[PDB]
Design a protein around this ligand. Structure first.
Ligand SMILES: Nc1ncnc2c1ncn2[C@@H]1O[C@H](COP(=O)(O)OP(=O)(O)OP(O)(O)=S)[C@@H](O)[C@H]1O
Ligand SMILES: Nc1ncnc2c1ncn2[C@@H]1O[C@H](COP(=O)(O)OP(=O)(O)OP(O)(O)=S)[C@@H](O)[C@H]1O
Ligand SMILES: Nc1ncnc2c1ncn2[C@@H]1O[C@H](COP(=O)(O)OP(=O)(O)O)[C@@H](O)[C@H]1O
Ligand SMILES: [Mg+2]
Ligand SMILES: [Mg+2]
Ligand SMILES: [Mg+2]
Ligand SMILES: [Zn+2]
Ligand SMILES: [Zn+2]
Lengths: 637, 364, 84, 699, 97, 66
């Protein structure tokens, strides 16, 4: 019993009593676990015993304890965890594992990168952001072994600890695995009564956009324990909060005699996956009730389809039908999985082709910034293994494993392909399978695997002459094969025809767009660039929370809500419209930019379903089918 | 010189020059460590101020407990704690940073049939992370000795770094300086009040080039860049100016590119196909030690926040063409390989030069 | 340590050029640039290695030449050469 | 001591062993008890493995509860701690083992006569010990109490072969079914199929079921469980157990005689007296639906021992039930933190999602379903139209796909020359005619269907590669996609996009059914008996009537002749036919099922067993059908010669066309489960061949 | 920048152009180069330096070397009626240097 | 560390030293303070031993309580 330990425990009791949010969070975890246990008893999921703690609240309550948490976490985190366990045990007596702690908030000088991690930060709580490059196999670690002695018919047990389990060092007492009892009787291992805690080690390298352009990168190992396991995949941007620890003896013992130094790693307490641009982490936003009410009150309006569309990229003049197509693609339709395993597409593919300087790349860059899981690729820059997958070899097991390409990484997401015309044919015929079957089949030497590639694709192409020609055949203008043309749901030809009034209006719009100042910025000061890393949970300038046209942060709240919540179902009144329009398009005498197949019918169904998603309707209506039908007519005529 | 090092320089301060080819990761050495006996529980502290040794623990944990020889307590409660009984208490121990560097003799003066010779060097504390590989340095250090386990008594030489001097300083966004003194701040304000500042700046651009005044004005405009706009919908508007110079051979366009490379704070001069061993745009290869993806280099990325001077712009590879297009317009480079997907900054102005077909330009 | 091979002119036609390791001491280091032909006088002696050679199956010793002297078989001008 | 403190657990192994023992003698499912009749077959050397079904134990517990007596939850206790209950069940079985009715002859196994000699030796030592102890008469003095103390001292003095050395059976735990668990309100985590994501450390020691695709299977190797040594000095046999990947052999004898003596004998290991298990190591991979979004599928190690070997093959989607057990840590020592362990699944039971055609047997329950499908009538059309029922129309294409699934008669000539019975089908047409959907439907239907892409599957991904297998420590040939589809269907989408090397590989596959590889790595011929279903587009991407159908089909004549059926699938717009397609597709999108309610599609498992019974049949041709086939072939050859100069030509008729007609006729005879080929089957084959190419191009 | 397969230690070699700094580079068979060599001599005759960004090394080496080269005409024989640009595979900018 | 855990005792040596210091300057038993005049004799080499009487401290505590 240590007196300063008890004093720190009592101080964290006072902090937990003052801030009732953590008191409510412990109770909310406990009622969820007890309700699931009662459901399993009567007729699932379990929540881990750890609490998110704000460092700013602790700093306001007690600056000494906050600086103790940051600077000497070994002396301050175990008292606080003991205090949290005491609180949870005092409340859970009426309805066993000790409670853990996680940390959020500003870290100040402790917000570092793997390059910025130095030996002065050892034995300190640090928050480190980077990219996950390597992850190890999840391995169980024996904590208590249970054994049976058949001669006496009794169960024995032995507890095992290692240096990574405790923040404070302890005298290492290595107790061997018992095969005798104290009297010499044979022991048999009771697998299933023993306890094994999951253990992982990941490598966090500094982000390639925050790393210097010529230097070799710096990384650090992070050890994760039971409930922090498998919260990451390789390629994720992460923020790991944990204690920068030194372990063992750096060769000072006689047996060791070498200059690896003291081995250093982060004992992770907290792992936040971060959303960065063109990464595999999907952007998510926490929806408050007020935002849900705003989304629902916009849903009842009649002009909601012409309000969200024009508010996508208001800094681009024209392309009004393309904005509608991008919105319906972001809604993304409903995927059908039949009882015999046959799959039907839900997502919408858009090809744009036409004259240069027509804001195609700007639209691609907008979709890269406004979509939750958009990944940007270029034509010749990416390759066949670049988009689909590749096979490499890991160091430990020596067996071949898979590296996921851009299409696999953008599963349930968005692929923005610029310079679609300049792509190699091998990667084309790779893309044929992805855009329809929505899967990637790898048949390499020894490995045969099917990966999910459920993706929306936006493509920007150019005509073979550099400029679109009205008098020439559009098949001659695009010069793309028929099978790729059929995959894309909507194909838009954007010609830079020039008229005096239109050039006047575009010139005024661009000139008034270049005269924008951000709020809080001086007239002469340059706008600074801060890279956007968002936490993933689970032409008028003054648009402020749905006055006329919505903000981009609110618009992706609407898209997220419509994607998770409503799953519209087709009905007869939409079916008649889409059947009539499909028959008319199949038997039209007019020449079309896009060929007409049975794929256009499913395009009509997906577009009607996507428009129903905009209205937050559980049913697809006639008005959805007609707008989906005459949106297709613009892309064809 | 590195190859004129001798046994007479052993354990003496040497001043020597070269190029650094590798910098290792930072290791953690103990300065102050608090140790405790395993069963005896005797508490001791060790202070280390010497980190000069390599492949050796010149200071280590004591081989037996120090409680008995001290005899500090009157009671003194045969008891032997054992060999190496001490355990390091890490939460109360202190550490510094140690870095391994490798210095090579400069490749300009190397014998033709010989591999260039190099030396392993050690730095600690504030001498670490002060130099990147590729930098030409002067180094003051102790020519020292270690045994590595080729001769019965042969020791490998190494240098304990006492001081690093960077002969020239490379220019990038990370090494850029934002601080300004008051006298140069006022002196630059006296420049802006001159109504003929435009004329004197255009005359200062390539003084040894006759004519091409409009091109020199355009170079002045290119060097400044323009106001960059970030809009509430997120669509970024670029302010950097890209200028192309098409023309007949021998008309000082390459000299204009070289002068822009010299005068720009950050600048990279390359050809259309790149350099001899430095590529164009962005190169994402694997780490030579850990096999993990990293950005090896590239002209358009190394000169972020600066100017890329592309000579012979007509002759270019196909992947470089689309990367150059994207990096001109969106000021970013999208990289999507099987291991890594990213969009990285290439906010740089392009000054390109090219020749037309059939030799000279044809008016017809 | 300097690797010295038999000069290809002196080698008999069908045979391969033999090579030796020559150890140069304090004053003799860096006097011979690789690719140049020299004459070395020295003591011909055996290398001592642990447990000899296990590949051969015979107690076979490697040999070296501890160089007593190196003789070779420069754009420096004197004052008279400048006058000339 | 306090070093190993004791804990109290709810499990008690005394009344659980008594419950196990009473279960094996009293479980009468509804001759005599089930497991007592099974142990008679085990004792008669006619049965090698004992399968303990947890459904039987659950029913036993239900009967005990209805009787009113109190029974422990044996099913749950087995589920948590199955590794102990394997040995408990083996002890219970060895306690109550019936005598063999049969006597051992010279045709029995060597292991059986070894175990019989060990049992006879144990009996003889027991009798000799009690006889000499009776000869002592060390008290000269209650007969029955004397015999009880006598057997007590005799069984304690002598060294016997333990029951581990006298067991001829392997014991496995079949998981309790979900349906049986639903009846008794029992919640079976053992039945619930988990992905590799969800097998965490808290499942260790439990009996769990994992569903996934098998990727790699090692070769069967003898893993020694206990090593036998002979000593010349004392005549004892010394046995040392082995439970790790490595062991140290015994040198000096450790028997009772040589321990006391000053001269210890030298032990010589004997392979035949030692105990081995047939051992396989397998890799199971997550299914694509199991993998979360943006993740890579993970793999699990499966250990297969005893009788269960060779029941797992690469590419099989399976439910593997086994005990999740830890293994000693493999990996770098610096990376390990504490008591880290590797994991593996010790396999207990395997269920196939797709049943193999060769494993089909005429069990009683199969027969009534086959008779029901026959007596429903119109089996050929019913099976063809129910192949991909979400695809509207394409009835003749689906008919040829069903004949693709069934196949014709594989022919062996006494000279050794072989004519393949497998049918090859090409489906070439305009984009958007759902040919990829049809390939996926067939290629999920067939038990050994492998789906490939034109450039996604390379040459080394088709044929073979010389790879090292580390568990058996040998370089072995590992097959590509064609080897994975051996005696199955290889599903080649984007046929015209393939490179020429893969075209040569399939060129050898399509006729000779072999792949001959002569590279630096390897000099082999390997069996690739795949039936090939290819999907393709014309040369221009869209079919045009201006060009010849040879011209816009970029396919060589030799590779054209290999395909028994080529379907041109034209997308011709019409007002009436497109409306039916539109209403079909909209109905499928709205009710998530098929439009026409006048017929019920055959389930893929029912279709699989009917096709298996069809593949068991071996039809032959008579004189009349041979004459009709000969006349049809002559007419086809003359017609092709006439069409050669015209644009109507679809190639030249070859003897391969004749063999394809015969193969299709035999497949159609197989569907009717007939031992002979009829006129009508030949006419159906001819009309399928004619409407494959000529009829649609004429329209 | 190359790693020795035995020593496992990396070396930076500037090549023949950097090694001939303040000297002479003698290039035989000038017409038979590959693309990488053509870029290297183009950079050396353009700005008398060689830029390398490999294996974490980003640097510029001085390549102020005079160049003497030997080449053969196309077809093995020089043609008087054709001019110099047609007689070699060398493009005009490298001929101008 | 955990090898020497801390304990909390009612004794505090800070306000006890201040109480001792105030006792030695302000205790006037009934020339000037007693122990201040005694320390003058100690400083003048006239007295060798200092006797602290607990009766004086008890009287000091009584006066502080009053
Ligand atoms: N107006 C000028 N004033 C001074 N020097 C000049 C002028 N024009 C050409 N030169 C010189 O001519 C030489 C040729 O260099 P450049 O003209 O820069 O080469 P360039 O032909 O323009 O580039 P190319 O098209 O790739 S060959 C240099 O030494 C220049 O200094
Ligand atoms: N007859 C049909 N019945 C039902 N769905 C159909 C039919 N024809 C086409 N489709 C649908 O139209 C789409 C065409 O997809 P695919 O199966 O890729 O067609 P395809 O013949 O493979 O085209 P490719 O790959 O360019 S040759 C799918 O969503 C099909 O479900
Ligand atoms: N209709 C438009 N409205 C606003 N800006 C435009 C429009 N068309 C082009 N621009 C501007 O012209 C620039 C050229 O880039 P972009 O048009 O995206 O090239 P491309 O069309 O070839 O992809 C962009 O920065 C964009 O802001
Ligand atoms: Mg563009
Ligand atoms: Mg030039
Ligand atoms: Mg397809
Ligand atoms: Zn001690
Ligand atoms: Zn013996």
């Amino acid at each position: 019993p240590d007196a300063v330990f008890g004093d720190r425990v009592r101080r964290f009791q006072e902090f937990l009593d003052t801030f009732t949010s953590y008191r409510d969070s412990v109770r909310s975890i406990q009622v969820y676990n007890s309700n699931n246990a009662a459901n399993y008893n009567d007729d699932l999921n379990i929540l881990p015993h750890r609490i998110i703690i704000s460092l700013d609240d602790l700093r306001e309550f007690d600056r000494s304890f906050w600086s103790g948490i940051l600077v000497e976490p070994a002396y301050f985190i175990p008292p606080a965890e003991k205090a949290l366990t005491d609180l949870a045990d005092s409340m859970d007596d009426v309805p066993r594992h000790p409670w853990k702690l996680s940390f959020k908030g500003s870290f100040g000088a402790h917000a570092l990168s793997p390059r910025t991690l130095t030996a002065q930060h050892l034995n300190k709580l640090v928050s480190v952001e980077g990219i996950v490059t390597k992850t190890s196999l999840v391995r169980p670690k024996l904590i208590r072994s249970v054994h049976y002695a058949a001669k006496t018919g009794r169960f024995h047990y032995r507890d095992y600890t290692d240096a990574t389990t405790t923040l404070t060092t302890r005298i290492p007492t290595p107790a061997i695995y018992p095969t005798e009892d104290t009297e010499g009787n044979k022991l048999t291992t009771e697998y299933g009564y023993s306890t094994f805690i999951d253990h992982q080690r990941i490598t966090v390298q500094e982000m390639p956009e925050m790393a210097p352009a010529g230097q070799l990168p710096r990384s650090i190992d992070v050890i994760l324990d039971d409930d922090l396991v498998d919260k990451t995949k390789p390629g994720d941007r992460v923020n790991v909060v944990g204690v920068f620890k030194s372990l063992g003896a750096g060769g000072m013992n006689q047996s060791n005699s070498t200059l690896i130094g003291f081995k250093t790693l982060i004992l992770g307490n907290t792992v936040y996956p971060l959303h960065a641009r063109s990464t595999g982490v999907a952007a998510r936003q926490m929806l408050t009730d007020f935002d849900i009410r705003n989304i629902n009150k916009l849903s009842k309006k009649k002009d909601i389809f012409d309000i969200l569309s024009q508010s996508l990229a208001p800094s681009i003049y024209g392309h009004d039908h393309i904005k509608k197509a991008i919105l319906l693609m972001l809604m993304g339709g409903v995927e059908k999985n039949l009882e015999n395993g046959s799959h039907l597409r839900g997502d919408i593919n858009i090809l744009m082709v036409g004259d240069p300087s027509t804001a195609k790349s700007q639209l691609l860059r907008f979709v890269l910034n406004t979509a939750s899981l958009a990944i940007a690729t270029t034509g010749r820059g990416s390759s066949g293994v670049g988009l689909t997958a590749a096979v490499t070899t890991d160091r430990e097991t020596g067996e071949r494993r898979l590296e996921a390409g851009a299409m696999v990484l953008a599963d349930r997401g968005v692929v923005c392909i610029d310079e679609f015309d300049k792509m190699t044919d091998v990667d084309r015929v790779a893309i044929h399978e992805v855009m329809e079957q929505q899967t990637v089949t790898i048949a390499k030497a020894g490995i045969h695997t099917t990966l999910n590639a459920r993706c929306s694709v936006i493509a920007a192409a150019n005509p073979v002459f550099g400029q679109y020609d009205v008098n020439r055949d559009p098949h001659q203008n695009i010069a793309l094969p028929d099978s790729l043309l059929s995959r894309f749901d909507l194909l838009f030809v954007v010609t830079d025809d020039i008229n005096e009034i239109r050039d006047r209006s575009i010139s005024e719009h661009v000139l008034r767009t270049h005269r924008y100042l951000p709020p809080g910025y001086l007239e002469g000061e340059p706008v600074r660039e801060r890279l956007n890393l968002s936490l993933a949970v689970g032409g008028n300038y003054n648009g402020t929370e749905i006055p006329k046209l919505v903000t981009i942060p609110f618009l992706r709240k609407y898209v997220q809500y419509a994607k998770e919540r409503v799953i519209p179902q087709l009905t007869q009144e939409a079916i008649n419209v889409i059947v009539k329009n499909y028959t008319d398009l199949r038997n039209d005498d007019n020449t079309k930019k896009s060929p007409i197949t049975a794929r256009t019918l499913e395009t009509l169904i997906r577009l009607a379903t996507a428009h129903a998603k905009v209205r937050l309707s559980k049913t697809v209506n006639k008005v959805d089918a007609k707008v989906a039908a005459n949106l297709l007519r613009f892309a064809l005529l | 010189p590195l190859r004129d090092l001798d046994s007479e320089h052993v354990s003496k301060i040497v001043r020597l020059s070269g190029i650094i080819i590798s910098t290792s990761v930072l290791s953690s050495r103990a300065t102050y460590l608090s140790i405790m006996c395993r069963n005896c529980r005797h508490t001791t502290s060790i202070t280390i101020n010497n980190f000069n040794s390599i492949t050796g623990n010149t200071v280590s944990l004591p081989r037996s407990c120090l409680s008995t020889i001290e005899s500090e307590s009157s009671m003194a409660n045969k008891k032997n704690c054992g060999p190496d009984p001490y355990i390091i208490i890490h939460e109360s121990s202190k550490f510094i940073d140690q870095q391994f560097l490798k210095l090579q003799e400069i490749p300009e003066l190397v014998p033709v049939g010989e591999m260039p010779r190099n030396l392993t060097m050690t730095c600690d504390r504030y001498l670490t992370n002060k130099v990147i590989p590729g930098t030409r340095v002067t180094i003051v250090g102790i020519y020292s000795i270690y045994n590595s386990k080729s001769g019965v008594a042969i020791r490998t030489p190494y240098i304990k770094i006492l001081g690093i001097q960077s002969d020239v300083e490379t220019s990038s966004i990370w090494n850029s300086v934002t601080m300004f003194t008051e006298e140069e701040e006022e002196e630059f304000l006296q420049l802006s009040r001159n109504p003929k500042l435009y004329e004197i700046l255009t005359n200062s651009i390539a003084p040894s080039i006759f004519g091409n005044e409009d091109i020199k004005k355009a170079i002045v405009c290119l060097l400044m860049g323009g106001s960059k706009k970030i809009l509430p919908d997120g669509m970024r508007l670029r302010g950097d100016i890209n200028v192309l110079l098409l023309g007949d051979p021998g008309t000082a366009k390459s000299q204009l590119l070289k002068f822009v490379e010299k005068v720009s704070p950050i600048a990279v001069y390359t050809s259309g196909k790149g350099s001899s061993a430095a590529g164009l745009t962005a190169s994402v290869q694997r780490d030579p030690m850990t096999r993990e993806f990293y950005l090896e280099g590239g002209a358009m990325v190394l000169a972020d926040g600066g100017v890329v001077c592309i000579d012979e712009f007509d002759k270019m590879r196909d992947e470089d063409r689309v990367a150059i297009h994207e990096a001109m317009e969106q000021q970013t480079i999208s990289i999507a390989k099987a291991g890594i997907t990213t969009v990285l900054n290439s906010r740089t102005s392009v000054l390109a030069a090219a020749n037309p077909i059939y030799g000279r330009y044809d008016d017809l | 340590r300097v690797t010295l091979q038999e000069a290809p002119g002196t080698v008999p036609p069908g045979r391969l050029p033999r090579h030796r390791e020559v150890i140069l001491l304090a004053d003799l280091v860096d006097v011979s640039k690789p690719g140049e032909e020299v004459e070395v006088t020295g003591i011909y002696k055996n290398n001592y290695d642990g447990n000899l050679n296990a590949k051969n199956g015979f107690p076979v010793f490697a040999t070296i030449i501890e160089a007593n002297s190196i003789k070779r078989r420069v754009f420096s001008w004197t004052e008279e050469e400048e006058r000339e | 001591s306090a070093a190993l403190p004791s804990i109290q657990l709810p499990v008690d192994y005394n009344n659980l062993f008594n419950e196990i023992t009473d279960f094996l003698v009293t479980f009468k499912q509804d001759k005599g008890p089930k497991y007592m009749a099974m142990l008679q077959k085990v004792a008669n050397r006619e049965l090698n493995s004992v399968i303990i079904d947890l459904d039987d134990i659950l029913q036993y517990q239900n009967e005990k509860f209805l009787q009113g007596t109190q029974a422990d939850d044996l099913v749950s206790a087995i589920q948590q701690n199955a590794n102990h209950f394997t040995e408990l069940f083996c002890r219970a079985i060895d306690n109550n083992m019936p005598l063999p009715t049969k006597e051992i002859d010279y045709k029995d196994d060597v292991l059986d006569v070894i175990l019989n000699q060990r049992r006879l030796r144990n009996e003889r030592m027991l009798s000799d010990r009690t006889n000499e102890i009776r000869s002592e008469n060390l008290m000269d003095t209650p007969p029955s109490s004397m015999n009880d103390a006598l057997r007590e001292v005799v069984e304690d003095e002598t060294e016997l072969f333990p029951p581990n050395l006298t067991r001829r059976y392997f014991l496995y735990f079949k998981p309790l079914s979900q349906n049986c668990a639903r009846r008794y309100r029992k919640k079976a985590i053992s039945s619930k199929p988990l992905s590799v994501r969800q097998i965490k450390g808290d499942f260790l020691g439990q009996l769990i079921t994992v569903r996934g695709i098998i990727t790699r299977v090692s070769d069967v190797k003898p893993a020694v469980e206990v090593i036998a040594y002979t000593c010349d000095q004392c005549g004892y046999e010394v046995f040392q157990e082995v439970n790790s990947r490595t062991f140290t052999p015994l040198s000096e004898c450790t028997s009772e005689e040589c321990s006391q003596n000053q001269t210890k004998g030298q032990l010589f290991m004997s392979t035949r007296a030692s105990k081995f298990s047939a051992f396989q190591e397998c890799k199971i991979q997550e299914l694509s639906q199991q993998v979360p979004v943006g993740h890579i599928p993970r793999s699990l190690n499966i250990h297969v021992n005893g009788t269960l070997v060779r029941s797992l093959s690469p590419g099989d989607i399976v439910d593997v039930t086994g005990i999740f057990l830890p293994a000693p840590y493999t990996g770098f020592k610096a990376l390990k933190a504490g008591l880290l362990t590797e994991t593996y699944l010790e396999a207990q039971f395997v269920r196939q999602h797709k049943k193999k055609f060769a494993s089909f047997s005429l069990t009683s329950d199969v027969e009534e379903r086959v008779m029901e499908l026959i007596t429903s009538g119109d089996v050929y059309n019913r099976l063809a139209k129910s192949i991909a029922p979400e695809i509207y129309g394409n009835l003749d294409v689906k008919k040829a796909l069903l004949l693709l699934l069934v196949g014709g008669v594989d022919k062996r000539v006494g000279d050794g020359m072989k004519i393949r019975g497998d049918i090859n089908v090409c489906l070439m047409g305009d984009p958007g005619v759902a040919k990829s959907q049809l390939l996926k439907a067939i290629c999920k239907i067939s038990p050994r269907g492998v789906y490939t892409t034109g450039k996604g599957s390379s040459g080394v991904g088709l044929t073979a590669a010389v790879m090292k297998d580390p568990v058996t420590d040998e370089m072995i040939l590992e097959g590509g996609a064609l080897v994975l589809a051996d005696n199955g269907i290889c599903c080649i989408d984007e046929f015209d996009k393939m490179d020429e090397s893969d075209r040569t590989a399939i060129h050898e596959v399509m006729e000779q059914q072999t792949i001959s590889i002569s590279k630096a790595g390897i000099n082999t011929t390997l069996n690739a008996r795949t039936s090939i279903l290819a999907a393709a587009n014309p040369l221009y991407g869209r079919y045009n009537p201006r060009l010849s159908p040879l011209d816009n089909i970029n396919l060589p004549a030799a590779l054209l002749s290999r395909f028994d059926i080529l379907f041109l699938m034209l997308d011709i717009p019409s007002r009436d036919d497109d409306e039916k397609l539109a209403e079909h597709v909209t109905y499928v999108h709205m009710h998530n099922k098929q439009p026409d309610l006048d017929f019920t599609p055959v389930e893929p498992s029912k279709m699989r067993e009917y096709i298996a019974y069809a593949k068991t049949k071996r039809p032959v041709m008579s004189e009349a059908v041979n004459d009709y086939v000969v006349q049809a072939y002559i007419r086809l050859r003359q017609d092709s010669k006439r069409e050669m100069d015209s644009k109507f030509s679809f190639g030249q008729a070859t003897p391969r066309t004749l063999l394809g007609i015969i193969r299709l006729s035999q497949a159609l005879a197989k569907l009717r489960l007939a031992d002979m080929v009829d006129i009508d089957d030949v006419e159906e084959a001819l009309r399928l061949v004619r409407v494959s190419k000529e009829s649609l191009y004429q329209e | 920048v190359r790693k020795d397969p035995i020593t496992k230690e990396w070396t930076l070699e500037g090549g023949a152009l950097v090694l001939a700094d303040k000297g002479v580079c003698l290039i035989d068979e000038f017409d038979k180069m590959n693309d990488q060599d053509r870029t290297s001599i183009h950079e050396a005759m353009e700005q008398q330096s060689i830029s390398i960004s490999k294996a974490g090394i980003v640097t510029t080496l001085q390549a102020r070397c005079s160049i003497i080269a030997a080449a053969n005409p196309n077809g093995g024989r020089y043609n008087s009626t054709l001019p110099l640009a047609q007689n070699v595979s060398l493009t005009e900018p490298i001929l101008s240097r």
